[PDB]
């Protein structure tokens, strides 16, 4: 009973710190979209211009929590990236199938989680349409990765994971829960999610928690496997991540 | 003996994480100095232009580890700031006495620690000269505060503090050690440090550690007061903070 109360406090602090990371990085694509140098490189994508944007994005990404910042042209090809010197450079790749590109193109802005296609690293993509005097020029994207957050959750001793409204695990202190599911997921909805490549080739399997037992207060007990450990019992609480479509669930070792 | 070894590892990890925070934020004033909009606002410091820089710096500071980013004109007055909406806005204040302004003006770049005059908040100021076609226009400054780092040190259970080459405490997991001294400090060198306003009005008193006893391996034992605690004995180790002029010292409770 007192464990449930403390666990709520700890879950609420995790979700609070997580919202603030996201909300901090929403500002970055918004300021870069109105940037004359960005607009200019899309108007005239010459070598000198793209090299200047490459250097600028690299320095901007160094200073910010976002792992990667990149510039996509109107055709959906990335022309500049902060990781331009890396073997995993996003430059030259076609993005155009990603909702973060096509919803930004259509609506002015977009945001979603994905397993990256070049990096093979999961993240949140926050994107903004770049507009010119005569209309849409491209899309600027910030990719936020949550490795540091996950490591902190892990070191707390109360594992946690974050799901969308379909119940798919996006962010997790235990890597092997990633893109597994809290909810059942009907065969006709699974195929479209899989084919979209949002979560790469993840089979989207239910999370392997056993003897899940719902309690009056909203919590559940369950049996779970953590690395190096035999099966152990946990209390699970959940809370909203405000300013997102996400839910945080946290396990407390009994 | 085994405590000293673990303590070295923990001190080395603190100093390593600290260097990386600093080195990440060095990139930010460097990229903003070559920014046409920044250069443009200094060439023509009109209301529309300064308002655009205010908004841009605000969004950039939100996304980055730096607390405040601000733009100083050639006369040393701050014309734009990320905190422009705050009661502690740096806009309108004269900086021109700070080494971070006048060394940037003279050398192109500067960096130092100070107790802020408007904020009353301590930080590292990393600055870069803004150059025009016909010469120096101003100075862009990023202010990095270390509250998050200090809180992490505190939560580790091994208190730590960071000194310059004069032995003045800049960064500390215990606030009351700030701007105290590890070394003695001759009366003729104290006056110039105090009068410079680098550390506000701090009396620059020696740290209050008692029964300091040097050990063969480089460590010392000492008696110290932590909040809520009576006097306790500590092992102290120190290590370089690479890429800085700083030394990290860490206490381990015996
Ligand atoms: Mg980054
Ligand atoms: Mg900041």
Curated annotation (Swiss-Prot), chains A, B:
Top-rank taxon: Bacteria
UniProt PTM comment: Autophosphorylated.
Residues exposed to the Periplasmic side: 1-254
Localization: Cell inner membrane
Described purpose of this protein according to its UniProt entry: Member of the two-component regulatory system DctB/DctD involved in the transport of C4-dicarboxylates. DctB functions as a membrane-associated protein kinase that phosphorylates DctD in response to environmental signals.
Protein name per Swiss-Prot or TrEMBL: C4-dicarboxylate transport sensor protein DctB
Organism in which the protein naturally occurs: Rhizobium meliloti (strain 1021)
Gene for this chain: dctB
